[PDB]
């Protein structure tokens, strides 16, 4: 009917925006498709994720450039602060939009384990991107919201998914990053990454070639962080 046709058009425009590398457009198209009220397939979930991660990823990178400049420049006007705060506000608005969409349409008690873990991990991620720029009481609440979302996804993944499942691995990875970079819990970050890597390793011999590459892709990232974090360099 009308809903199906409209949804299909927005998905098609999201894919067109993807090919044109118009990620803000892509995100808005996927948001409209979500608001048609139907579940997202795996492919569509990834289109949604790609779009908003590209948008916020560009803002995060800009925010980090400006904070770095700010440090050394502040080592003289208010321009760097004002403009960094302009980028902050925009980044906060995009995360707010994603978090609202997750809460209003995507996070449900129903659905396979992958979908529920996917969206709750995504919720932890966008709260984590908010925490990167937050200060004060707002930061403490955001951090609590990130942890709560990550922990809920972790509970489901540990109960319903194998240790090698790439969505489970991706969640553990990001949660460990949260521990290290946001929650100020380096031992927990290192412990969680170590456990995730090891528990995955123990089951690799059972996987197909395609599953093996998907799992090992994230396992290398875990290793990469472990090597980074476990070093007397600083």
């Amino acid at each position: 009917g009308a809903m199906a046709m409209e949804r299909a058009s927005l998905i098609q425009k999201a894919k067109l925006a993807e090919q044109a590398e118009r990620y803000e457009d892509m995100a808005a198209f996927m948001k409209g498709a979500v608001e048609k009220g139907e579940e997202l397939s795996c492919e569509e979930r990834n289109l949604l994720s790609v779009a908003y991660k590209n948008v916020v990823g560009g803002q995060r990178a800009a925010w980090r450039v400006l904070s770095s400049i700010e440090q050394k420049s502040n080592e003289k006007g208010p321009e760097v602060r004002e403009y960094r705060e302009k980028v902050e506000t925009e980044l906060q608005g995009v995360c707010d939009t994603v978090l609202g969409l997750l809460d209003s349409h995507l996070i449900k008690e129903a659905g396979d384990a992958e979908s529920r873990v996917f969206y709750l991990k995504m919720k932890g991620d966008y709260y984590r991107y908010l925490a990167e720029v937050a200060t004060g009481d707002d930061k403490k609440r955001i951090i609590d919201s990130a942890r709560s979302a990550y922990q809920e996804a972790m509970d489901i993944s540990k109960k319903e998914m194998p240790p090698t499942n790439p969505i489970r691995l991706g969640l553990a990875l990001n949660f460990s990053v949260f521990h290290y970079e946001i929650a100020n819990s380096p031992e927990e970050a290192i412990s969680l990454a170590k456990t995730t890597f090891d528990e995955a390793m123990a089951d690799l011999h059972t996987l197909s070639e395609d599953s093996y590459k998907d799992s090992t892709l994230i396992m290398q990232l875990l290793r990469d962080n472990l090597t980074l974090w476990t070093a007397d360099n600083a």
């Binding site: 991706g170 990875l173 990232l221 990469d224 600083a234």
Partner: peptide
């Protein structure tokens, strides 16, 4: 400490 790697685009 440089920023750690998070899950990639799937």
């Amino acid at each position: 400490m440089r920023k750690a790697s998070s899950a990639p685009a799937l």
